[PDB]
Write a protein that binds this ligand. Structure first.
Ligand code: PLC
Length: 269
């Protein structure tokens, strides 16, 4: 149900997300190479990818991840690590909807995700902008898994519009705001949002919709099981804000499903 090239991208960015969890990639020196223990990120190691900016424990809520320059794919990637520390975890629990009119009118965002991003937005905005300046033909992709995908999604919407497109691939990310935000993210221009969910990962199902949360459209639903490898016939495209049929179904959610997005993700020591 997906082009081989979309499939290829989906995998490449699942490994960049994965790579953000690896400890050594969070305090790496600029210019060294992105590598992963285990085989967390073979493709990324295969490419000519080097650290532009490595950050850890930044702003509020322990914002951690890296900014890499991929010369092989002509890419400027900003990957956010998902949840690992306790501050990451406390921050996810600020689930009250904060108001993010600056981003869009009527739009309300999950508090913590927004606060974390807002607390590190300038520094990162500028690191991305210098990057683009030096490699203006390169493509800017923001990515991440779970909390990292939420971060990537709001940073994405926040920075789109300064003369460089921003594509966002998110894996197993939770809802990030009200329906106003959901509609906004669905339509924004200046790059694409790729919202990838896996079977019944519990994470894309929170916060509940009763708290006033929604999901943007569409959703690329990976339907092959945990530990089995993904092919392009497994990824299905589900359309419509708060659509059911994809991940969003009335049934028992699962935890380990969240850990399997093309390969093991989030478990990188
Ligand atoms: C019903 C739960 C209340 C949540 C309310 C809504 C808030 C939004 C949630 C943000 C979603 C998010 O990215 O992480 C949320 C999810 C949900 O975890 P869980 O199975 O709900 O935890 C319930 C367990 N308790 C009851 C103790 C709280 O992480 C996962 O699935 C687990 C991911 C495993 C990776 C290991 C993490 C290691 C670092 C942290 C160790 C303490």
């Amino acid at each position: 149900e997906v082009s081989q090239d979309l499939f290829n991208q989906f995998n490449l960015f699942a490994q960049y997300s994965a790579a953000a969890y690896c400890g050594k990639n969070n305090d790496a020196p600029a210019g060294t190479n992105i590598t992963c223990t285990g085989n967390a990120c073979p493709e990324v190691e295969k490419a000519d990818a080097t650290f532009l900016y490595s950050f850890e424990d930044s702003g509020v809520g322990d914002v951690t991840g890296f900014l890499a320059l991929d010369n092989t794919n002509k890419l400027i990637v900003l990957s956010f690590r998902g949840s690992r520390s306790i501050e990451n975890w406390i921050g996810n629990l600020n689930f009250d909807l904060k108001e993010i009119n600056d981003i869009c009118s009527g739009c309300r965002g999950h508090d913590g995700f927004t606060s974390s991003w807002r607390s590190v937005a300038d520094t990162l905005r500028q690191k991305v902008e210098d990057a683009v300046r030096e490699h203006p033909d390169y493509r800017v992709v923001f990515t991440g898994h779970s909390l990292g995908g939420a971060l990537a999604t709001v940073a994405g919407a926040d920075l789109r519009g300064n003369g460089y497109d921003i594509d966002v691939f998110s894996y197993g990310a939770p809802r990030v705001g009200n329906r106003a935000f959901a509609e906004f993210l669905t339509v924004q221009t200046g790059g694409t949002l790729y919202r990838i969910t896996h079977t019944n990962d519990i994470v894309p199902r929170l916060p509940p919709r009763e708290f006033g949360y929604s999901h943007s459209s569409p959703e690329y639903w990976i339907k092959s099981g945990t530990l089995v490898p993904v092919t392009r016939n497994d990824i299905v495209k589900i359309e419509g804000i708060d659509a059911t049929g994809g991940n969003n179904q009335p049934n028992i959610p699962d935890i380990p499903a969240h850990l399997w997005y093309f390969g093991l993700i989030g478990t990188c020591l």
